[PDB]
Amino acid sequence: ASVLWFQGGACSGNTMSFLNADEPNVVDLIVDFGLDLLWHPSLGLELGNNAQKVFWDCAKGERPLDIFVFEGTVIEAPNGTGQMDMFAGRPMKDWVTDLAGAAQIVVAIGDCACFGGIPAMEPNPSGSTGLQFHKREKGGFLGPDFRSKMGLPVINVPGCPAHPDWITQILVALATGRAGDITLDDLHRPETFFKTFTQTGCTRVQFFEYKQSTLSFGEGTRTGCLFYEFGCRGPMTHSPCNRILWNRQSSKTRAGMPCLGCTEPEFPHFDLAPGTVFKTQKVSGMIPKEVPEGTDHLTYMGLAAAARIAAPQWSKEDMFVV
Amino acid sequence: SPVDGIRRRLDDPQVAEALNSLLDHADLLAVLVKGLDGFVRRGDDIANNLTSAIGELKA
Numbered sequence: 001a002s003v004l005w006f007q008g009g010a011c012s013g014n015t016m017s018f019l020n021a022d023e024p025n026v027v028d029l030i031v032d033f034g035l036d037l038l039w040h041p042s043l044g045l046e047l048g049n050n051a052q053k054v055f056w057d058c059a060k061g062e063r064p065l066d067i068f069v070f071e072g073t074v075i076e077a078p079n080g081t082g083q084m085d086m087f088a089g090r091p092m093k094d095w096v097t098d099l100a101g102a103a104q105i106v107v108a109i110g111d112c113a114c115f116g117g118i119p120a121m122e123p124n125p126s127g128s129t130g131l132q133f134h135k136r137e138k139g140g141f142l143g144p145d146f147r148s149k150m151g152l153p154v155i156n157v158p159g160c161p162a163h164p165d166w167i168t169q170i171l172v173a174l175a176t177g178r179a180g181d182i183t184l185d186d187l188h189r190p191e192t193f194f195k196t197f198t199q200t201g202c203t204r205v206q207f208f209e210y211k212q213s214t215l216s217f218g219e220g221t222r223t224g225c226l227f228y229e230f231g232c233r234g235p236m237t238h239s240p241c242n243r244i245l246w247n248r249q250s251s252k253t254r255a256g257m258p259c260l261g262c263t264e265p266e267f268p269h270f271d272l273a274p275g276t277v278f279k280t281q282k283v284s285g286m287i288p289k290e291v292p293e294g295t296d297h298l299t300y301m302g303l304a305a306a307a308r309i310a311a312p313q314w315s316k317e318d319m320f321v322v
Numbered sequence: 323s324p325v326d327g328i329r330r331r332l333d334d335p336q337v338a339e340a341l342n343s344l345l346d347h348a349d350l351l352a353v354l355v356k357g358l359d360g361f362v363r364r365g366d367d368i369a370n371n372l373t374s375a376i377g378e379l380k381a
């Protein structure tokens with residue numbers, strides 16, 4: 001299975017995260033799983049005209065392209081020319097057009113590629129967009145009706161960056177005959193990773209249940225949930241970040257950092273407008289503006305009051321102790 | 323004897339039936355009294371929870 005991994009408006013974080021892959025690690029994925037990595041800007045040996053030969057052979061159908069991985073945004077500025085992202089003699093968006101049209105499967109890795117991500121933040125100088133989404137709005141660069149040659153839409157492996165497993169396990173599934181096991185949600189994300197929430201497996205959910213808030217960073221995060229004071233988007237964000245830990249160690253929320261909802265197409269949420277960074281926007285100083293997914297402010301708040309009154313003592317003390 | 327009379331009431335089919343039904347749901351009564359004991363032994367905590375809740379509405 002040939003893989004061509006291109007980077008548009010990328011920071012290469014998805015590649016670096018991918019390189020952190022374990023079980024399989026990246027080398028075993030590239031070699032031992034029958035995935036022929038044709039080229040990758042961070043890893044491909046070919047430069048210049050040899051690399052362009054590889055790209056053109058993929059684009060024109062001279063050689064098969066099974067998986068086109070795209071990382072980074074599709075940069076369309078200036079004026080829709082895409083010349084703020086010139087790659088191998090073309091605007092990167094033209095490469096995207098050709099290769100997405102050539103690939104059996106197109107995988108957008110990372111929010112930039114999936115939805116536009118950080119570069120698509122206003123004022124979006126690069127005219128960045130995702131492959132098939134611009135933020136939540138379906139269509140992105142390739143249009144809502146784009147399908148790869150295997151009939152799939154762009155497989156969106158979101159995250160900023162995506163966790164290595166979010167792509168590697170998909171690649172293994174494709175390589176092991178389990179492509180049919182891959183189900184995609186409405187954002188084209190693999191449901192095997194994105195039916196759960198970041199909160200799922202969060203070490204602070206018991207504090208969340210009892211509405212015990214982390215009050216401060218550092219040692220303050222030895223207790224409490226980050227939802228109330230730090231804008232944790234865990235309960236509104238689909239991800240397996242607390243199921244499949246980052247770097248096989250931790251997750252933002254475990255570590256005391258609020259989930260920024262990076263697997264969600266709106267990321268960065270509120271465009272990091274003043275007062276929204278590591279803060280919970282609240283109505284009347286008590287009611288979070290955004291409640292967990294599938295809840296309503298009145299039942300949430302009622303249950304929150306009930307949970308506060310019935311809170312056990314341990315939920316009000318440090319638990320992640322030295 | 324008065325105690326003999328309570329034993330006599332215990333013989334009564336209807337009294338016995340009710341006492342047997344009480345002993346059937348005795349686990350519920352036990353758990354509710356245990357729940358009350360728990361609530362009482364954590365009454366200080368629940369009072370501190372109501373204090374922190376009112377103290378938030380104060381701020």
Ligand code: F3S
Pocket residue numbers: 009010011012013014071072073109110111112113117118159160161162
């Ligand atoms: S990791 Fe980098 S490539 Fe985009 S998805 Fe995040 S800015």
Ligand code: F3S
Pocket residue numbers: 198199200202203204205206208224225226227232233234235253258259
């Ligand atoms: S339970 Fe965890 S995911 Fe965030 S909302 Fe609380 S720190």
Ligand code: F3S
Pocket residue numbers: 159160198237238239241251252253258259260261262263
């Ligand atoms: S910011 Fe992203 S990496 Fe996971 S903890 Fe939140 S979905």
